[PDB]
Design a binder for this molecule. Structure first.
Ligand code: NA
Ligand code: NA
Lengths: 191, 191
């Protein structure tokens, strides 16, 4: 029963991944706006004499807005990533799997981990960088849920489960905060 | 009988006009290519991760090529401007009006000045800066031709004409060389 985020080396690699995804989005968005700004200033610089230069900024602006939508599609996937980790770690694992009592309780536990492992993610169209690193994190949860759920079918196994998953929690919260900061940053980009 | 290019102040204002037209074309073309270059490098910088960024350079490139055509339409008008001055000053004035002999000769002179005054210019679509400064020079010839042609209908008037137009010749050649250099520069821009 390995938990990829129970190891500090994996957690850092994953936090970097998200940082890299956040920073890239910032850099690229600026790059697009600098191009867009530069385009506008140029047409303004020769607006009296060169009338055709006005045709360009609108073309660069229509793209800039398409680009912003993709960046916000990325944000949306990141927030669902934050939600997902809360539902796995806090609602399911700590809420149910650590507080297991009755058949009717674990009836929730093993199912609720199954519903989690069965969930998939909308990819970010035109942003395969975001799709790849986000799916990688989404799927760590799916795999950890599955593993945990297979290791039922009691009270002995649960104390081992709790103890074994414990090192993963700080890992998960580390990754959740990275995603949460990436999602926050996107909202602030247009400023 | 004033000749606008017989005065050193007007000739300079006109040479500047053309210089301003040459330099602007250079500056703006570079401005468009810098934007275009910057657009391409940006998509290259994030080609693995951000697939949608590739949509932009093609849009900026289609414009860049439209822009080059306008700059070359400007060149074409400038070269016709050079040709025009040669036909007025060197072929007509010095070729015919200074060498006037017979009725059949001046039959050419007054007509040939009339055909000149009757010629008009194709404007440079999307480049009203170029249209304005080029038409201004085109029309100085048209007006000077007309004036000269009205001041027939002999051998007395011709020596006054010759002498009076003389200060204009250096003016014209000054303007022709400016236009000739502007036309030359355009051919070299894409490099
Ligand atoms: Na894990
Ligand atoms: Na003149």
């Amino acid at each position: 029963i390995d938990f990829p985020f129970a190891h500090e080396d994996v957690v850092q690699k994953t936090v970097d991944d998200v940082r890299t995804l956040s920073n890239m989005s910032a850099a690229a968005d600026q790059g697009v706006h600098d191009v867009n700004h530069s385009s506008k200033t140029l047409a303004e610089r020769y607006k009296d004499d060169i009338t055709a230069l006005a045709v360009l900024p609108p073309r660069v602006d229509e793209f800039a807005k398409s680009f912003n939508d993709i960046l916000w599609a990325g944000r949306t996937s990141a927030t669902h990533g934050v939600s997902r980790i809360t539902d796995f770690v806090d609602v399911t694992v700590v809420g149910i799997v650590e507080d297991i009592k009755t058949p009717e309780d674990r009836d929730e536990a093993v199912i609720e981990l199954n519903a989690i492992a069965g969930q998939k993610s909308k990819p970010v169209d035109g942003f395969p960088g975001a799709t790849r690193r986000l799916d990688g994190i989404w799927n760590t949860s799916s795999t950890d849920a599955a593993n945990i759920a297979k290791v039922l079918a009691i009270e002995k196994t649960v104390k081992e489960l709790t103890t074994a998953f414990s090192p993963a929690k700080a890992g998960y919260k580390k990754v959740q905060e990275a995603l949460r900061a990436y999602a926050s940053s996107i909202t602030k980009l247009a400023a």
